[PDB]
């Protein structure tokens, strides 16, 4: 062979947040916030100090998380939901096993309507009750009837199967062309390789060998992923689930399309800037094309969903989506699907995330009294995922052909 | 220390009165002594007396019996009848004479009735259901009440007639009781391990089975071990529970009148065929029809079991779902009178019973209800039906 | 009809006394008021008082506690001690100061004791076993007694002190009770659906949990919901049962003396370390050692549970098997006196508890026993220990 | 091909006992017995009228079966067991869920000590409490290590496996040479064929194709099998389980031995004459060589075991064996093993049965107070089984070679 490739199943597990200095760095940050707080009057809050960004909301939530998570199942940041509808009121969402009348809650349990954080920036606190295939020509094509491979296509390891998310290329090294899907779909620890096939692996049925997972990430610290401390727990991780599969050397890349079937041509990834106005993400209509539920549409309901489970480990998921018109946004098997902003002004729809859709990252949510609870879906921030995997999205077939010729 | 006395032990009483020789011989003597233009049955007592006397031939090739009105082509008649439930109703051509049920039975004293054959076997969302399950500012009939593992519906606001005369509520036995626990604490709408809620109190007393002669005042059959399913539980409100948050209204129904005793000697149509309703935590407000009374057991034990009230929901819809256990069964208003409660739903629904009425539809669910007048007597409870009477009951505890 | 009155309903009482504010405040007031050459504990009361006062720090990193004598290198000492049960006993090098248990605790009044750490967790064939299981011409302590699904051992011949003063027997609660059944009939040795046997009678009354202050006469701990596992059931003999076939002897032991009350103020070695025996339907005659008293709960409820007696069988053999539930725990004769019963086996054994004593052997089974004196008081029963006293009891029913 | 073979899975099920005349024939027999009974005194029974045969005992049992089976789990005929030992006292054995003292039984339940039947013949009634691998060089050889096939060898269909019982030849038709095993081991209804292999079928491991089941019987009426009515039920059947497998046309019969390994050369089948003295069967020591437990020894404890289960169907099993010295006589997998009388006077051991060892034909029995219950085994009467299948046993290798040359 020409160059040396890694020939070992090799695993690195996080230890940085377990260094006394790394925990002290987080403790010092919140100690600083606490030392300077000087909370405002028993009273009125100025409008210019109202939170106006994801980062504004996430810092208020982190600062007040002990009281917030004492009698709740989780929190996220977004807009207050009132009578089932999104308002334009910036808010921390507090998820509860069941919303009950104030009269059945002592004052310690009853959430406040307003929280003021460090620097005087304040926001609303909203209470949301919360818990943790299709037949069409499109679904047929995604699962094997189509002459091309692309976003939405079924991708299968020996064990599980999911949805190809995007056509991508490595920024460094061999600069190989491949695809992005989620890590759980693509990986099984009982095997030394992770081969992927479309539509099925040889033990289960017909299919072409697409290539094998080269690298994948599951957990990333919040301070590395978001650039801030998103909570006070020294062990805080984002489920940054993602796997990169370089196309096999004898796989015909001319069968790959960069089009998202059912959507059309998409634009470049839209990064989530934590400092821009909330309404460029929260409340935006999204769509996804998956091998299980085909094309669906939904609403981004919240960002940076937090969950505290068995040990003193805090877990974040980036994007919370609910399907429109009381239809589920996804099903099991849609994991890896691209989460795409629908066009507002005629611009190409742009991807913002990839469906996580896994172990505990699908559940139910209650919005109205006249109808049953609704499924919610979780997504990983795509701009951040591409950064950690060091990949670029390829959005045109002309750019795909250039990228193939430029592999080394 | 404390001022008054109350339960400090989980203490169980089990029935033994019917196992006495003299008790069984009294029952055998009654029937042994007893053994067509006959002044034909006009009351529940008349039908139950005929069925008890003929229970042996009736139970031989059947799944159980009840009393009511003959059902013909799926419609209730006004013909007084013993209903005989069978696993499958088949043409008379396929039955030997011993198996084919009669059309008429004559009982002691010449009182007679008809015999009818019925084929038989043993979540909703709304603003109302949301109020019952935690969104309302009050607790009352229909509210979700929860033990650590099981959930049901509060039936009535009640007061004990004796002892500490405590105010509390009535619900069903095993919505309220978990045998892994030494106490029986109940919450609205959820226990703390599952979600938020107010601690209501704990079960103080409950009853499950009662002998037929004590419950009905008559021998309901020839089996010396005959019992009635009487699964009711009484929960006194906790010392720190604010009873000013309690309503005596039945939301979705309104103010109710006093309990309507089921008198076995009154005309059959004052109970059979009557329209009823219920407000429950799972299905909200539903409407149904009383189809039968005093249904027997078919569970192979060797022991007769009775259930008081059989209800089928109107327009082929289910009258109750699981979680409606404990809801009040209420006679709907007919001539302007306040609706009056006659029973309480016995939970069921782990293995539902269904009955076949017409050939063009599948079988329909049926609901069991416990006779409320008799249940209140056995637990020595008075129902409280106005908020002013409730304030009085609180002061008198 | 009948002449005397008896139970006609399955009726359940559940404890609520400890849920009163005044009851819990009395307990909190007692301990709040309370808060090394100290006249060091000499009785069960002394140890239980120290353990209750320090229960919070003791229960923080432990699976439960009991009182007795320190165990050192697997052998019982005569050193009065609180035993602290842990999931695994580890070297002090691996414990922070908050976790490492003390060696000495001083309680109210300066009374002190030792603190000991024990690692812990929650068929035989013979001529005797054949006699107990149906081959003997008599029924007595040790005989197999069976419900429709569960089987156990008859504990004692007893008489009710009040009401009908009926003669019957004492056994454990859930050998005797099946919650699917309205009655609780028991047979020797098998119910009719399984094999031949004589109908003994049915359960009349039973108790499972009792508050600690009512059972022990003291607060056994700081938890306002503290209960004792008191699972005993009383079965009056059936009207047609021939009590002349009943013996008061304990086969394999002999004539027993009266129940030996466990007095909390007497010296510890009159109970702790005492040799005991038991005659049970599954393991026949076994011998064991009383290792501890008043063991606490560790079951995460939020509720303290107590068990009275902890027994480990001698020579590394099990003291009981499943089916021995209900056997009498009897102090063996030491100076010629008749053996005297002190407890009754609480069944267990679905998920046995074991404790580690030495490093060269696996963990050993331990047996739970219920304090017999207190159980008899709570069910208002007198034990009958001679056949002449039994004839008297029969005549006086 | 030369001659025509059956090319269909074809099933015949008994209907004869359902004819009104066949039920009347049985009813008339017991009606005759009842009409003439004239029972003896409240008292003494003559010795010359004491039952002295299997047939004597079986007729007393049939005549009195209503009272016998009212409070019992089954009956058999044999010798009274007293304090765990066989006596020489002819008796009906009555099997009970548990033996209890008389004092716990009303007089209706308590069995009598004596029963007198038609003709004045009488017998004892005995009460018995009752309910429903190994590593050695021999077991290795039986399961595949041996160079030969013979009695005791493992024989496997695709699903189950058992023990080859005897080398046999058909009395009629093609007169093919093959082997006898039990029907349940050899047969599965989901397949059209029943191929048998030693030691394993191809889906499970290595093995040679032995041939396929040609014919098998499961249930035979008592009056056909025993030559008498063994009970009053118009639906009475013997579990006459047996399957005949002719050796495949390309199977090398020179690999077959007629020796019973661990026993030696055996004699001809010993028929069970229902009129001969009881002690030529009851109480006799037996042995069996099976693929699961190898060579074991046991005692014939009883004959014509009766069982009444769900419908009004009475079932008989011929031979009841208990292992010696509290060792189990067989295990699952020994089904089909030959049940052989050990030598008394130096004569070759002779086979009397074949282990049924199946659905409900193994259970436990209590004999002593100082020890736990013991396993019992069931066998099918071999002389009768060979008659119904029309087969002869081959007991010498010289006779085997003659039989092969004489196949047509
Ligand atoms: N810890 C809690 N658990 C459950 N319910 C709670 C809790 N704290 C508050 N609530 C309920 O949530 C209510 C506030 O809900 P929320 O903040 O969503 O109001 P809103 O957005 O103005 O209106 P809407 O309820 O229609 O969304 C309180 O009035 C109370 O009934
Ligand atoms: N033991 C039995 N098991 C099953 N079916 C029986 C049995 N005995 C009678 N039947 C059937 O039930 C019929 C009687 O039905 P039933 O008494 O309900 O009549 P109906 O009320 O006049 O009419 P409908 O069938 O419309 O209700 C018999 O004619 C026979 O076909
Ligand atoms: N919370 C705890 N969990 C587990 N092990 C503990 C804990 N606290 C103390 N220990 C261990 O138990 C030891 C004390 O044991 P213990 O009191 O039984 O001593 P001993 O009776 O003198 O000797 P022996 O170990 O022979 O019984 C400590 O030295 C420590 O190793
Ligand atoms: N229906 C029955 N169910 C259970 N046990 C019974 C029944 N009828 C009788 N017995 C018991 O069986 C006893 C008779 O047993 P059996 O006929 O085996 O006696 P045996 O052979 O002389 O002695 P051994 O009991 O030592 O075998 C009776 O005394 C009685 O205790
Ligand atoms: Mg809201
Ligand atoms: Mg009808
Ligand atoms: Mg120690
Ligand atoms: Mg015997």
Swiss-Prot record, chains A, D:
Disruption phenotype: Narrow leaf phenotype. Reduced leaf blade width and plant height. Altered internode elongation pattern. Altered vascular patterns in leaves and culms. Utilization of photosynthesis-related QTLs can enhance high-yield breeding and provide a new strategy for achieving increased rice productivity. It is found in: Nucleus, Nucleoplasm; Cytoplasm. Changing residue 183 to R: Reduced grain yield. Expressed in leaf sheaths, leaf blades, culms and panicles. Preferentially expressed in vascular tissues in leaves and culms. GO terms for cellular component: cytoplasm; nucleoplasm. GO terms for biological process: internode patterning; leaf vascular tissue pattern formation; regulation of leaf development; stem vascular tissue pattern formation. Disulfide bonds: none annotated. Keywords: Cytoplasm, Developmental protein, Nucleus. The keyword Nucleus applies. Involved in the regulation of lateral leaf growth. May be involved in the regulation of basipetal polar auxin transport (PAT) and vascular patterning in leaves. Controls photosynthesis rate by regulating carboxylation efficiency and consequently photosynthesis rate. Controls panicle and spikelet numbers, and grain yield. This is Protein NARROW LEAF 1. The gene is NAL1.
UniProtKB/Swiss-Prot annotation, chains B, C:
Expressed in leaf sheaths, leaf blades, culms and panicles. Preferentially expressed in vascular tissues in leaves and culms. Disruption phenotype: Narrow leaf phenotype. Reduced leaf blade width and plant height. Altered internode elongation pattern. Altered vascular patterns in leaves and culms. GO terms for cellular component: cytoplasm; nucleoplasm. One of its GO terms (biological process) is regulation of leaf development. Utilization of photosynthesis-related QTLs can enhance high-yield breeding and provide a new strategy for achieving increased rice productivity. Keywords: Cytoplasm, Developmental protein, Nucleus. It comes from the Eukaryota. The keyword Nucleotidyltransferase does not apply. It is found in: Nucleus, Nucleoplasm; Cytoplasm. Involved in the regulation of lateral leaf growth. May be involved in the regulation of basipetal polar auxin transport (PAT) and vascular patterning in leaves. Controls photosynthesis rate by regulating carboxylation efficiency and consequently photosynthesis rate. Controls panicle and spikelet numbers, and grain yield. This is Protein NARROW LEAF 1. The gene is NAL1. The chain holds residues 40 to 457 of 582 of the full protein.
């Amino acid at each position: 062979c020409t160059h040396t490739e890694n020939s070992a199943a090799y695993f690195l597990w996080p230890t940085s947040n377990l260094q006394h200095c790394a925990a002290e760095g987080r403790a010092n940050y919140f100690g600083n916030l606490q030392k300077g707080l000087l909370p405002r009057h028993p009273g009125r809050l100025p409008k210019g100090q109202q939170a106006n960004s994801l980062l504004d909301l996430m810092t208020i939530r982190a600062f007040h998380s002990k009281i917030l998570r004492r009698f709740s199942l989780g929190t996220a940041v977004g807009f207050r939901i009132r009578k089932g509808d999104l308002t334009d009121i910036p808010a921390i969402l507090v998820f509860v096993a069941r919303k009950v009348h104030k009269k059945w809650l002592n004052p310690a349990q009853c959430l406040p309507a307003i929280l003021e954080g460090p620097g005087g920036v304040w926001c609303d606190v909203d209470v949301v009750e919360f818990s943790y295939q299709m037949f069409s020509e499109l679904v047929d094509k995604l699962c094997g009837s189509d002459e091309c491979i692309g976003s939405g296509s079924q991708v299968a390891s020996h064990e599980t199967f999911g949805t190809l998310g995007a056509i991508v290329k490595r920024r460094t090294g061999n600069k190989q062309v491949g695809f992005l899907t989620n890590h759980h779909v693509a990986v099984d620890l009982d095997y030394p390789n992770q081969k992927m096939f479309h539509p099925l692996p040889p033990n289960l049925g017909p299919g072409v060998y697409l290539g094998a997972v080269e690298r994948a990430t599951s957990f990333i610290t919040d301070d590395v992923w978001y650039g801030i401390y998103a909570g006070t727990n020294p062990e805080t991780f984002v489920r940054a689930d993602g796997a990169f599969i370089p196309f096999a050397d004898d796989f015909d890349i001319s069968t790959v399309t960069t089009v998202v079937r059912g959507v059309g041509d998409i634009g470049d990834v839209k990064v989530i800037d934590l400092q821009c106005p909330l309404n460029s993400l929260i409340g935006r209509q999204v769509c996804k094309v998956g091998r299980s539920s085909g094309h669906t549409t939904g609403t981004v309901m919240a960002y940076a969903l937090e969950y505290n489970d068995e040990k003193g480990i805090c877990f974040f998921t980036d994007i919370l989506v609910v399907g429109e018109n009381r239809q589920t946004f996804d099903l099991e098997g849609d994991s890896g699907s691209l989460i795409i902003l629908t066009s507002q002004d005629g611009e190409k729809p742009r991807p913002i995330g990839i469906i996580w859709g896994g172990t505990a990252n699908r559940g139910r949510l209650k919005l109205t009294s006249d109808h049953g609870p609704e499924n919610w879906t979780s997504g990983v921030d795509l701009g951040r995922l591409l950064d950690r995997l060091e990949l670029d999205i390829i959005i045109t077939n002309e750019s795909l052909q250039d990228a193939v010729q430029q592999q080394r």
